[PDB]
């Protein structure tokens, strides 16, 4: 089976995190005539990092999911890319964001024995405040348009799922209240909030504290409380 090759891949791409991640130690100890070396290396390891999650083969102009999704669903794997993600570029963390959101129920049920899923949430956050407007509005449609749809069950239900739509919507409040197409998102969004049942809700690892008045701007007095009361809202 490939699941040993993937293990493989992983092992390969976990040893130039460990290099990268030990990079700024080695710059601190460095004669200046090596630094410009220990630049380029830096490069080509994120790069090669990169690309052994994300890249592609001869005869295709978008990479193929595979490779990222067999990472994702190992223990080691989701773990390794948290640690990744802040060495990318904005456009590669964003590209890894959104591969993750159109693939998300498949991921979330390889986590169910494991559970460390959640270990991508601090990073995907910090990610999420350096998106504009088209990027945020881009995931959430993405994650509205999976199997299921308008239904969201399998994301709500869980912990990671859960959690990450809170944050996208809570980023989303930030950028408008600096268009309507957002407002289309929002309003999908309330009613399937409204519609799961409070006991098939997931405990959110975090509860951003602008949530209230994000749903204020499109819904009543009334289902704002349910939704205060269904996700123990501030
Ligand atoms: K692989």
Known sequence: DKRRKTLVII??????????????????????????????????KICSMYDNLRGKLPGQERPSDDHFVQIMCIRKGKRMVARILPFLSTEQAADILM????????????????????????????????????????????????????????????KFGLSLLLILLSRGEDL?????????????????????????????????????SLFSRYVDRQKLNLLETKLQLV
Request: hydrophobic share 40%; glycine share 0%; charged share 20%.
């Open 176 to 212: 408008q209240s600096s268009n309507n197409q957002w407002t289309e998102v929002m309003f999908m969004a309330t009613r399937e909030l409204l519609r799961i049942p409070q006991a098939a809700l997931a405990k959110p690892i975090s509860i951003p504290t602008n949530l209230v």
């Open 11 to 44: 092992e390969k791409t976990y040893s130039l995190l460990l290099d990268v991640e030990d990079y700024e130690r080695r710059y601190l100890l460095s004669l200046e005539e090596e630094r410009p070396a220990l630049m380029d290396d830096r490069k080509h």
């Open 99 to 158: 591969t993750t959101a159109r693939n998300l129920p498949f991921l979330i049920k390889k986590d169910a024995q494991d559970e460390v899923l959640p270990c991508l949430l601090s990073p995907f956050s910090l990610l999420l405040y350096h998106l504009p407007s088209v990027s945020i509005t881009s995931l959430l449609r993405q994650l509205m348009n999976l199997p299921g749809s308008p239904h969201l069950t399998a994301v709500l239900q869980n």
